[PDB]
Amino acid sequence: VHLTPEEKSAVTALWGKVNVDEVGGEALGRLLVVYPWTQRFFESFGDLSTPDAVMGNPKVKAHGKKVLGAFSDGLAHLDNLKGTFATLSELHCDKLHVDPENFRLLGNVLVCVLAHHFGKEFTPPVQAAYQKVVAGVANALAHKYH
Partner 1 sequence: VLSPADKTNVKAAWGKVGAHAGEYGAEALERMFLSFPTTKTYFPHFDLSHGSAQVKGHGKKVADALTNAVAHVDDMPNALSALSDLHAHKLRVDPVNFKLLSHCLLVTLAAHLPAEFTPAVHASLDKFLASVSTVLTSKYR
Q: Binding-site residues, please?
A: 1-2, 63, 82, 92, 143
Pattern 58-87, ligand HEM, x by CB under 6 A? --------xx--xx----------------
**Number of residues engaging ligand HEM in binding (CB under 6 A):** 20
Angle between helices 101-118 and 23-34 (to 10 degrees): 120
Label residue 47 left, alpha or beta by phi (over 0 means left) and psi (-120 to 50 means alpha). beta
CA distance to 65, 67, 135, per residue, from 72 (Å): 10, 9, 14
Verify binding: residue 143, its own copies, rule CB under 8 A.
Answer: yes
Binding-site positions for (2R)-2,3-bisphosphoglycerate read 1-2, 82, 143
- Which position among 102, 109, 126, 130 is part of the footprint of ligand HEM (CB under 6 A)? 102
Q: Would you list the DSSP string of 54-73? A: HHH-HHHHHHHHHHHHHHHH
* Spatial CA neighbour of 85 closest among 20, 142, 45, 25: 142
What, of ligand HEM, its own copies, partner 1, none, does residue 76 touch, CB below 5 to 8 Å by kind?
A: none
Half-sphere exposure of 144 (CA within 13 A, CB side): 16
Residue 95 beta carbon to ligand HEM: minimum distance, rounded to whole angstroms: 9
**Residue 32 Cβ vs ligand HEM, minimum distance, rounded to whole Å:** 8
Footprint on this chain of its own copies (rule: CB under 8 A): 139, 142-143, 145-146
